[PDB]
Amino acid sequence: AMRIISVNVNGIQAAAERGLLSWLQAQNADVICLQDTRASAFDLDDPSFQLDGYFLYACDAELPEQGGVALYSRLQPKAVISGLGFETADRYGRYLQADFDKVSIATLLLPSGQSGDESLNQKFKFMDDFTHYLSKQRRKRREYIYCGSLYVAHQKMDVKNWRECQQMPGFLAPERAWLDEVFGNLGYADALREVSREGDQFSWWPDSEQAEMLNLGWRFDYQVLTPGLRRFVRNAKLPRQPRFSQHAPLIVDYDWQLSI
Amino acid sequence: GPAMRIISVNVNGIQAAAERGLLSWLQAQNADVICLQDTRASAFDLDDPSFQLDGYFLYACDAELPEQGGVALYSRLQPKAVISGLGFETADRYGRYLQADFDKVSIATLLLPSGQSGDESLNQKFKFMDDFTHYLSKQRRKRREYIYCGSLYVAHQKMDVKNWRECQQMPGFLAPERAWLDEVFGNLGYADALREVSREGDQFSWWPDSEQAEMLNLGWRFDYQVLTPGLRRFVRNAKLPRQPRFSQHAPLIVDYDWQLS
Amino acid sequence: KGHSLQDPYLNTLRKERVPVSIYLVNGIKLQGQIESFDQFVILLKNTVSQMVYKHAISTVVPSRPVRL
Amino acid sequence: KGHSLQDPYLNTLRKERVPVSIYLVNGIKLQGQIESFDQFVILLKNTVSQMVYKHAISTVVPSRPV
Amino acid sequence: QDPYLNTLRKERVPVSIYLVNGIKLQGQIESFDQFVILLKNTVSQMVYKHAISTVVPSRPV
Amino acid sequence: HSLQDPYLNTLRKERVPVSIYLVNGIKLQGQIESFDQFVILLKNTVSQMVYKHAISTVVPSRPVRLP
Amino acid sequence: GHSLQDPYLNTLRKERVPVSIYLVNGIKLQGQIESFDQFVILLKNTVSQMVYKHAISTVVPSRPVRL
Amino acid sequence: SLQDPYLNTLRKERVPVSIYLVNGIKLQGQIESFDQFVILLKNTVSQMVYKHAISTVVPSRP
Amino acid sequence: GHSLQDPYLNTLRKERVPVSIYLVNGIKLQGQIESFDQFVILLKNTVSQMVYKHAISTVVPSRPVRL
Amino acid sequence: HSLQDPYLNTLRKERVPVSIYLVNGIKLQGQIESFDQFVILLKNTVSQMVYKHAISTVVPSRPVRLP
Amino acid sequence: GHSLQDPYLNTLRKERVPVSIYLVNGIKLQGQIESFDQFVILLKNTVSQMVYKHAISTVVPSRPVRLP
Amino acid sequence: KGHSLQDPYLNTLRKERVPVSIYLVNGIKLQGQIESFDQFVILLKNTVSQMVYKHAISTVVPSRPVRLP
Amino acid sequence: HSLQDPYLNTLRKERVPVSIYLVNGIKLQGQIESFDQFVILLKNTVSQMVYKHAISTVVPSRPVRL
RNA sequence: CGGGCCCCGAACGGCGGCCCGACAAUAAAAACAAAUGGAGUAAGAAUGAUCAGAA
């Protein structure tokens, strides 16, 4: 087995009050990649967030409310690294990576880009910087699993009424083109769309009860994995959890097992 | 804009060209670098501040005897590094090569022995050609891109020479010269800027002394801008102004969109 | 083989011994350098030799720009 | 003979330098431009000079009509 | 092999081709050869013979 | 040469309802109308031309005896 | 050429050894080879489905047989 | 072709090789015999495979 | 000699500023500084591997620290 | 002197299976047999001497605490 | 010892010339020389990066400097 | 300068005529028997007398284990 | 030093064009301006200092005697 | 030992001469965390002024 959980909690505190800690504790998994901690590493040090039988790793942004990402693993990773050299990355700890034998996973959290124009500019900046870094991450032997919420949909199949969202951030032409270039040209794939080419599957919908009723979801979570692991995809699922997190948990299993 | 102008001029003696006004014309003619060839003057002669143009850095590697050969190179901004060696007796002892270094590009002034003088000159030309194709086979390994300002004294194809049926005896269009040049432009991958921009005839770069050939345009395209296949797509425009000619060769100006640094 | 554009490419990849990244149809990637080739096989020297088949190669991405 | 229709189409795409998107049999989209081609190989120029074997090319979609 | 596809092309029958990867292609047959089938649908979406699994015409011929 | 052609000719003459499965595993159905060295015509509501290089196996819905 | 697969398959057929042909898609095919020829092998399944060589990948016998 | 030298060398030295198929499943075992069409692995079961669905043959030891 | 390296490394270790070491081979490291001495240094990370000084190329702290 | 000798002595005493990576990138394995101011003997199946100027770093397989 | 190093290095530091340091493997660094000693050099760049002497290959300044 | 392990180890490998396999820092495998060693050089006896330098050697891998004094 | 110092001094005297090769395998052209126990000055456009431990060999462009 | 080269038979075989198997040398890459699941997955053109299809 080889499970991976992705829950952009948008605040580990709200996650705790919503019962995310108990759900993850009950949810038997190998690695858990929650995003947007909205708290300092010292806050994550609170044993309440420490899941029984899992390690604690977290990198906080310069400003807690800005972001922050954490990573829980069942076995001691070979090494944990944070940052990518970019200001938009280092100054906010939006990237944290653990190292295991043969495969090393990472936790990515892109800026929403929907708050303001400056957020969209930062999004474009981080996108170009990240595709550059990944170009530098081509011939690298170690296979990767960039588990992160990219705040962008690849195809219309990933979001309904695209006609209305075409101009709204998250589905704009340049972001979709960047994602397509990152996926196809560079040989990267996705476990879900590979194992299950089924529409209507989303992760992030408005907290508004109306959108939840009519299910206005935007697929923002993606299990970006190097082509080496593409062959070892078991199955993907997007549970419709009752408002536990804006980004619904993204659980995927893999045929390839892990090792220290 | 991100324009890069390179001016290659074979003067056959900088003295005559300067007398005809090449120095002032170049000083006025904006250009990033000038690939002036065939100086016929020593480095100490080029050291004369009269040839040294303001706003440029002069670099030249003369031969053992000035009039025999000699090549120089101008540069508006200080190049990263300049090298004046090739490893051949036909090259080092004759200062026929001088290469500068830039950001991912290498401007190189090249001057092959004419060969039209005597049979010994033809033998020297064959020797230099084989040594230089060997050097090119060795250089293709290098990742950094290269530029070669070179008056090769060899006609490439029919369009690159008038009345080739008659010129098939004159050095420049000979069968072995043609083979060598097309192999350089062929298997070795190197390309030309003029042939890339304008596949139009009547474009020559050398004429005899008799004004009859000039009027009839019985000339050869002995000047080339051998480009590494990389910048081939980045060739903007090229021209061969025949009227403002200051020697048997004509000034060959090529402007690119690539920006050095 | 009539035009044989693959032959010059493989020859320049082998002569310079450039690091190649031969992708396969299944999805795995094979790092190394082309030691030799024929009609249906290519030799990748990565510590040990690899008899990667031709019909299984999806794309060949050399990590080193090869002028030609 | 074999490429009486493939050869002219690919040659036109090359001469016109139309940005094409090659879809592999594996389903991986490959955007770029056709640099050169032959009997069973096509050179795609992009950020990385790529060589895609014909036998593993499912479809090609030029971005503009030709 | 040749006559069937030639009739499909000349008669301008709406064809839908399922590739070996399963992709349901749609379009009209423009021109075909030993190892190529030009599918005319907005763009000249060329399709190789080795990758075609089934050819589903909209009506029999 | 000695087995494929007679088997397919018998399946065609007897018009046995065969079930063909593609290399990918997609299950198809229909009768064998005509055979070819490179392709086959499977008439099932709408005649679909299937390529031989994409045929995994040929499952006849009824047992068949060779001649 | 083709001098090795012929005797191997002929021996597998003669002794009627249960082979498990694993297709390229990862599907099991337990049965006995009834016959074999070019571009075709004939299983001894309840329906005796005809398989194609291009699709076949491996031919493992449940019991190790001698050459 | 260089395939036959490689294969017969592995056969003579009987090096444990790991063969990857077009699907990607990793096989293991020595090579007993081989021709142009098939390979006869020396595995516990000696699973025979045709040459039209091979990816890469690699020896576990140099 | 070695009058500047000592205070720099001592401050980096005391403040436990996460540093990223880069080996001469081009390999990168991460983690705080555990200890240091002549020809040897100890890295404070998930694993406390011992790195020799003669193989280190650069010492880049995550956040610029003051000497 | 102050930190290298105790660390190496503890590694040798505890006989922890360590995997040393050379500056060239080669991966080695084995137990620590003995060390010196210029050389270290690593025993894996057969004793393999390694020089101190050719090691990138020492990675103990188990966390260790200095004395 | 080092009769020629210290003058050149302290002159570069005084003039605060943006120098480009080339390492043994080929990668090039950039930044003004902040401080140095017998074995390490500090770059005033935003990263405040420190580089060891035994790993540095060449120190090429961006502009010619006068010898004191 | 006054070590303890290198000298006896190399002397034993020389006397016992053990086929030694030396690893260079470049990653090339040298094969041969130890002829004689010094503070800075090791002579590898393999048909030709290759004078391999100490600082260029990465590891000394003998073909068979040897007892230690 | 025994021989390296006389050789470098002779090269500096005539300012002979030398080619210094680093351990990585690259060659640097120019002429020696000065040297010491650990560094060598190779003047060429800019004064670039190179360390001894990183140099592999000094090859003069033309024949020179001690 | 086995790869690259030329030599020779009748797009197709193969044999001798050899060389190498550590690149007579990248003006330099803000950095390579270290080199068989298996009896088979295919939801709807905002509308041809009008389609008979054979031994």
Numbering used by the authors:
A (entry chain G): 0 to 259
B (entry chain Q): -2 to 258
C (entry chain W): 3 to 70
D (entry chain V): 3 to 68
E (entry chain U): 8 to 68
F (entry chain S), J (entry chain D): 5 to 71
G (entry chain Y), I (entry chain M): 4 to 70
H (entry chain X): 6 to 67
Q: What are the paper's exact sentences on this?
A:
The widely occurring bacterial RNA chaperone Hfq is a key factor in the post‐transcriptional control of hundreds of genes in Pseudomonas aeruginosa. Here, we describe cryo‐EM structures of higher order assemblies formed by Hfq and its partner protein Crc on control regions of different P. aeruginosa target mRNAs. Our results show that these assemblies have mRNA‐specific quaternary architectures resulting from the combination of multivalent protein–protein interfaces and recognition of patterns in the RNA sequence. The structural polymorphism of these ribonucleoprotein assemblies enables selective translational repression of many different target mRNAs.
In the estA 118 complex, two Hfq hexamers (Hfq1 and 3) enclose four Crc molecules (Crc1–4) and a third Hfq hexamer (Hfq2), like the amiE 105 complex. The estA 118 fragment threads through the assembly and contacts all three Hfq hexamers and all four Crc molecules. Hfq1 and Crc1 are flexibly tethered to the translation repression complex and were excluded during local refinements. Focused refinements resulted in a 4.1 Å resolution reconstruction of a sub‐assembly of the Hfq:estA 118:Crc complex (right inset and EV2E). estA 118 is presented by three Hfq hexamers and adopts partial ARN motif engagement on each Hfq distal side. In the Hfq–estA 118–Crc complex, Hfq3 presents the first longer 5′ ARN motif to the Hfq2 rim side. The Hfq2 rim side residues Arg19 and Arg66 form hydrogen bonds with the exposed N‐site bases C‐28 and U‐25 of estA 118 (counting backward from the AUG start codon, with A annotated as nucleotide 1). Indeed, disruption of the ARN pattern of this Hfq3‐binding site in the estA sequence resulted in a decrease in translation repression of the corresponding reporter gene by an order of magnitude in vivo (Hfq3mut). The proximal side of Hfq2 coordinates an estA118 hairpin‐loop structure (hairpin 1). Indeed, removing the prominent hairpin structure that is recognized by the central Hfq in the estA 118 repressive complex (Hfq2) promotes translational repression in vivo, suggesting a somewhat antagonistic role for such hairpin structures in the assembly pathway.
